[model samples]
Target chain A: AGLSPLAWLADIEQRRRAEGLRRELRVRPPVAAELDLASNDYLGLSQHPDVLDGGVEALRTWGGGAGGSRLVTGNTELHEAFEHQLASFLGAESALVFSSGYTANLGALVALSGPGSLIVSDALSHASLVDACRLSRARVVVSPHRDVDAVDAALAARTEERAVVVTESVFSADGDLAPLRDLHAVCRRHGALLLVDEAHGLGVRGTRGQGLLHEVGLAGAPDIVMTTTLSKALGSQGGAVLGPEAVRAHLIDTARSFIFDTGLAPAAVGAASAALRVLDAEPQRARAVLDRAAELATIAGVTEAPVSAVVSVILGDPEIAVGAAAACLDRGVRVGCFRPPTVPAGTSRLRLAARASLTDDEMALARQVLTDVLATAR
Target chain B: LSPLAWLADIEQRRRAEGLRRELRVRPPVAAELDLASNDYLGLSQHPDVLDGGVEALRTWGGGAGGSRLVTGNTELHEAFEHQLASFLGAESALVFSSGYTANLGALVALSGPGSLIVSDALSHASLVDACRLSRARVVVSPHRDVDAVDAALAARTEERAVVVTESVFSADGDLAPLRDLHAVCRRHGALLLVDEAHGLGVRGTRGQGLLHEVGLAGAPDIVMTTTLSKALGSQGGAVLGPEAVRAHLIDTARSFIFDTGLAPAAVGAASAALRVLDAEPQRARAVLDRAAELATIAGVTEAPVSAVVSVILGDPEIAVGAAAACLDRGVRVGCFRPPTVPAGTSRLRLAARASLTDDEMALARQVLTDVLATARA
Candidate 1:
């Protein structure tokens, strides 16, 4: 109904530029001296030759595509293998592969909720969770950040038939874990389902990276469903929903994304399987990521977790976050900047992901860069 | 939270009984079988395919992980988009992760509350699922019945509406009367949306699609959606339409704007597949040849289009039995039950593939006929 609307978008761009928040792509040489503190490759397996071989071999075997949706001819053996390994490792009865973490979240919530259902989500939940809840057509009650008492009160006030109490295992913003044990317990009283976005935790939480749930002994819980991305530490593309067998089976029958989307490519499937195997074999990968996280936290003068690999340095403002990130990049380091809309107000920060492969010297340099960048921002 | 009270889901039970849908683990499927695969020609794993994908991967890295609205879109993605548009004979095409995603994106974006989606009841499950996503009133007309679709569209109370159908039913392998569907849609001031999943690289004068086959390519108010995974022999899907409609999808479709971009390897592989398809016009002939021959074996059962033949098994379990028997004899085929096929009629589905050799077809026929007779009711 409208033409290019370049005029409106241009004005927004001007505002972004004025605020020092305009985004543009930068192509870094593959083996730059810059520490990759920004990438999600925790336990750094992306460049492993075995991982590369796994992907290439699957592509050679499964051809180039999944010919149809999984319900039909699309399901491949590699897909099943990935799902099986993921489910077994993550302590779930079953799991289904989706095109991405975004789809995995969207498909799970959308497929689960109905008219009488309610979704009690955290205030600091990711954008994907918020959108999925909205699309689920549920009466969404946004609970105070990490406030399970508030969530319990909200649920008690509602007469909803079904509900999914949602929270992130590791908040992408602040390097904080949701009070998982407390939140899961509160939801139990109200007979609500616990949906955790284990995107960050899956590759760094437990001893072998089964995530926060496994550490908390909730991995096998029937009421809990977890979704995670393979692109992160798994060093692959796509995502999976880990849940009880019955619900998982039902999702295959009704989940729009699963029923309609092409099966995950064989290479991604193969890569994920290979990554999980590596995660198990190199059981100390999680610890290595944790060590790097501690190193960054000490260097940045910021708070870090005892277990997780994500270390964040709050920039206090979006402009500062952008400046800090850009400064780090100038020093030949790559770091993630969480800016407006993606981050909560007044909490802009740099997300330092501690990949397993970071050498001591590279990590020290990364630490120096972050410390310098923060100083420059100040 | 209360955990799942273990209940025997019939579908789950079926799967436990070895009837649950699964993938065939064929490491190196003989290059000789009658090609039932979406590989209309034998170039899926071509060296050029791997090289294109590897080069893109070397350029884009292993994963995108980010959404198009964020950090995912790349040059590889745009190139694939433009290539698909030119091939489909559309002003533009917006690529999605799968044909299912494409239908979900296009249908939900175009039709919403206060509108009607007059869809062929037999369209892909994704189209049906999309209707659930959009708050639109969906009128499931009789399969491919233009008159029914017209009557339903005429009853729309929405500010706008869309008519949905598939160019070819994946099961029956029968092409829809697209021109008639288009005319009915126009008569009712509605949009005609076709899922050309089976038609691309299979039908159409230039192997473009059913829209071309019916002289409706670039027709007014026409939108075509198809899977790149199929006849193209690659991964992903795309929606082709007027440039304006595509712009709207690029800006608004939640499935496109929110989800991670298609993997670079998939985009690269699909691009190569399209190039291979455009160059080999005779691939269509090879596919049809296999299809025709597979449908003609006297001892084996056949179906209408000869493009897909069904050994009609009366009971749902019997269909699985027939498939198992065929598998036991070293022939892999698909079995359809309640929802995959319409209820009551279960079937063993054999596809006429592009890469299937003449000798393979003869062996396939013998294997299928032997299994069918043994499993006959």
Candidate 2:
């Protein structure tokens, strides 16, 4: 009774506790640079000594925290230059960095979405995007994943004054590519804007690792907004939105997360920029991760162009996915496990990633271990 | 058009025109010992640079892409809890990806529009922004001036109210009259929220932070929020408090309840840093030595030193010049200019590193002389 008002879903909690679906955090040492198929460091640059040094050196120089927000003595030239570099790399007129991909998505949606807005989204989008829509006070319709025609119909049917089509270029779980072009066309017809979550795209897609839309020739398009994670491809932590200078400006002014959140750490900003350079210098690594993914799926029996760096094999149940992952880890091969909540209820998956630096032998070992484990899974 | 269709700024310009801003970065000039970084204990690049990150990357890979409620929660995060709680003398702790996020999580979770926020006029930018974003009816009182806080607290109509301030003000390099503020909050029946960003590794007798330094280590009513990046010289931020307060934060703080858990490397490093601090009291003593030396060399008026040192230049253009001049002479300093200033003031901040030597401070004297020679004109 003392703190029960804070409890919104006690029944749900009971169900979660009964099922052992509770989440727990595991430690990963800083020096343990494993086969990295588990993280978003698609470019294999987060710990590039250069990036680590940039962070350390910045801290050595800047101290620890930025000490303030961008508007209040917190913003630095390091953050400013980093923003410019992102704009140039992503081909957007302007860019703004936030604390996390979740924050960025929340800021964009909640600020842009309101009672009169309709958020038409792909059903299999990132959780942050879905959660953002729920938080935005906007009307949302979850169309089937990768189905542009359904999205088109959903958008056309909305009577709201403001309409938006939100999706991810590369779905995180199924590893299936979205029909972005078709969705963009639908958005155009409905006069709505499209927000693309490129969490897994940058440094893992396009020619020279520019990203999915850039690979598809959609750079600098007026109606599209791209949001991404630095923890993944760029090998750091934080999130950013790339769009028109106007939108970027508005986010700085009106987006609560961008305006209120502590400016991105100078260390992360500098480190991420260094990583972008690493990607530019090693375009071949981007190509190699793709080739690695191809090898992974062959063992799992899938034939498809790689979608970002993730290759998913639907194991269809949570316990099986957990068993399979544990078996691989037992063999010293670490893989990501996706189950009921992270994935749709009926499907569980193994998230296999390709990094710019994975050696051929490492790929072979990972594949051999993956296959051997699942075969013996309880 | 969707309700937000009008919101994307598709045509161009947020208004007829907007206040345009830019960030420009340049490689540091080679001859300067930097004094402006938050790496308080100089541990960011200790020989064990790869220890935490290597372990994290090896174990968790590159990205813990999922949120805390999802697969993102990890054991390293759990270990940080015990270590952080012990360091701050609090019941529990919760980690956010950054210090900025920690503020968001704290303010939003505890105080809303239904609540009242009585804060110092000179609160950190994040605290000010939190007050604005929160539904709270905010009252800004005088800086470190306790009676002003009481006056504001007395005016609050909400059943719940909060008082916020920093233990060490980064800009002024001075300690807050915190003992006074805490006493006032207690009298008014409000909770005291302290932003111990600058105080954690530098102050208090035991260096347990300003709270412990002043015999107020863990007042059951006081809630402390801090960053792991400073003195700890790692990354991320955390909220430390009683079990119920922590429980409240977990249920409501958007930054923690909704965001991804802290990365593995940060958790490992933060834990390791606490261990280092526990082993070496000399590191804490060294920070004070550097601060004192920097004050003597730079001259207190232009560059006053306490827990930190700042070369107050009064104008952005002057600050840029002073920073440039100092850099030309081989000293790396933090330059604070326009837009980043509070209204129209500018200054170059130099937070001395512990490893700086006597020779380095002597060199800094001439470096300051050369740079400010032109600016002082």
Candidate 3:
């Protein structure tokens, strides 16, 4: 049969297993049985009573799904209210929500930059951003991570009339803050637009959880646009692009992802709205997460603390990182294990996420488990 | 000057051409009869569906916390996937955050560099985007032309080929020649990918989908992608195929690997919707009946193959005015213009819901009769 088309997949799977890079999904329970430092629920608001009630109420009122695209019967008053609230919270001219952060990035980048435009992206941009750059049909140049001069040079030498500089506010895997101010200044010098993804910074960066853009005093800069995930710190699902009204109108008219995909579910909108309210009332929760992350870094024996809730412990071998994570799970503490492709090769690590609601008992348990696991793995 | 200032000029041009789009917020309790949304089975607000989502929200929290390979994969996701695969008569299934990502994940992962993708010209935009991302040599075969697909597959320089098409076209609301395409794929040793977005819950006798209705359901070489938001009345999408393909997608698909898993409420809602579909198979029949009724009201010459009833108005302004007039008379229908449809094929895209009451249908007939006549005139 001229070599079955799918035969290559089994060979690839075998090679991945031999290389200790194969991935698998483990079914978590309704109520976690382990001390969960694996999830991105930084404020631990996902299970909060008020958030749950908000989601349930919306489920009762608006039903399960948004029913269609935002332009065609899916744009509910709830969606409009949520967008308005998000824009107000983020200090942006307007906001547009998409089904997920990945789509939001894709929509924002592709719609904002096209054939005649130039896109300067960071080497460490998220996969979604990388994919969007590929689909943008623009002449793209990947600059080194946090390299402002390279971005500036790329923009200066660009032949296209328009250019966009793309970077994440907080790098997802390494949990380091991007040089937003430096980048924005460079973009200003070159008359380029700066697009930042605050996926990890939204609920963990500012005192009031407004995000890194707000923390850095660039909240609503007309030349800067930002995208953030509600699933991460807001303890909900979906994503939004916050920028000038023109950009919002452009995305509404042209972004393929938003034009094609269904609207965010009402449950997620309601939950995120309630989570924002909670963050406003309890701003201390953001600091609490940073404190927890510092403690986790100490326990994991990492020299530097994370600026966000993500505490990454670099273990050079994928097998060692996997083993350490498994050991933690065996001791009732769950942590994330990152290997090749998610992270660069030879830099496999344990990604420990901090939650504001972690109790002392949970902390002590994580401390004990991670200490034992990392020591043995080393 | 701001770099984004150019957007204003584009917006102005779009406005003059009747291409400017804006969001209109629907109320919690709709004032007008709904003939626009994709809730084909009318299960979105069903008591069972609502209760299922609310209960899941209370039990499992709001978000899925992380990506699936990390902590986002829950027992609920697994259970729902199993239920969906069983219901659709597939070997296995994997869920993504949206149908867009589901298509992206499947097409991009299945066919890549050194491969060939024969896509129907009328394929959904998501599929078109996926074709771009796949890095495969894509030949856009004429819409539903099996011979072109066969020739492309046979004459390809690449070793592998995948044929892509939607089971039911979205805007035109026409059925693809799925059986013929699959037959050609089998002969050419190519894989077939079908998007059952508009076909599921309104095509088969028991809502198993058009693929099942056409006896292509569990074919080893055929993969089906369906949206939970459409007929199941929930969020998310799923790729169903062989177990090996599921494993391959989990290991490779960047969209699935990078994105957060679907929320627990969506999984719960879809699971309950599937149960309701099983218990009340007649829900599927009702959608077709309602669509037929809608076609009659619009004076469409052909009966609808799916829940969509499209009435063509030659220009965008005519379609917009007719849709607005219908809303004025208490009916809400979709207005599809260019880029969503062809340039002279702007249409009033009326979606039929199974739960539409008789009074609602009578009102739709009354409003559409007046609006569409005026539009045609």
Best by DockQ: 3
Positional deviation of residue A360's Cα in model 1 after best superposition, in angstroms: 8.5
Q: Which segments of model 3 are wrong by more than 4 Å?
A: A1-3
**Ranked candidates (lDDT, high to low):** 3, 1, 2
Q: How many angstroms is residue A194 displaced in model 3 relative to the true structure, after the best TM-score fit?
A: 0.5
- Could you estimate the TM-score for every candidate? 0.81, 0.67, 0.98
* Residue-wise C-alpha lDDT for candidate 3, range A1-378, written one tens digit per residue: 423666677888999899877777888887678889988999999888989988998889899999999988898889889899999988999999999998999999999999999999999889999999999999899999999999988999888888999999999858999999999999988889999999999989988888999999999998999999999888988989999989998999999999999979999999988998898889999999999999998988887877999899998998788888889999998888888877888899998899999999999998888888898888
On residues B1-377, what C-alpha lDDT tens digit does candidate 3 reach at each position? 56888899899999998889888888888998999999999999999999889888988999999899888999999999999999999999999999999999999999999999999888899999999899999999998899899889888898789999999988577898989988888788888899999998999999999999999888888889999999999999999998888999999899998998898999889888998999999999999999999999999988889898888888888888888898888889988888778778888888999899999998988889888888877
User: What is candidate 2's TM-score for chain B alone?
Assistant: 0.88
Task: Give Cα distance to truth, residue A255, candidate 2, Å.
Answer: 3.0
Candidate 1 residue lDDT tens string, A308-365: 6777777889877777877887897867777766676798888777788889889768
Using lDDT, give the best candidate's number.
3
**A240 in model 3: Cα distance from truth in Å?**
0.6
Q: Write the per-residue lDDT of candidate 2 for residues A208-272, one digit (tens) a residue.
A: 88888888887788888889888777776778888876677667666666654555655566667
* DockQ order of candidates, top first: 3, 1, 2
lDDT score for residue A207 of model 2: 74
For B320-350, candidate 2 gives per-residue lDDT tens digits of 7787777777776777755555756788787
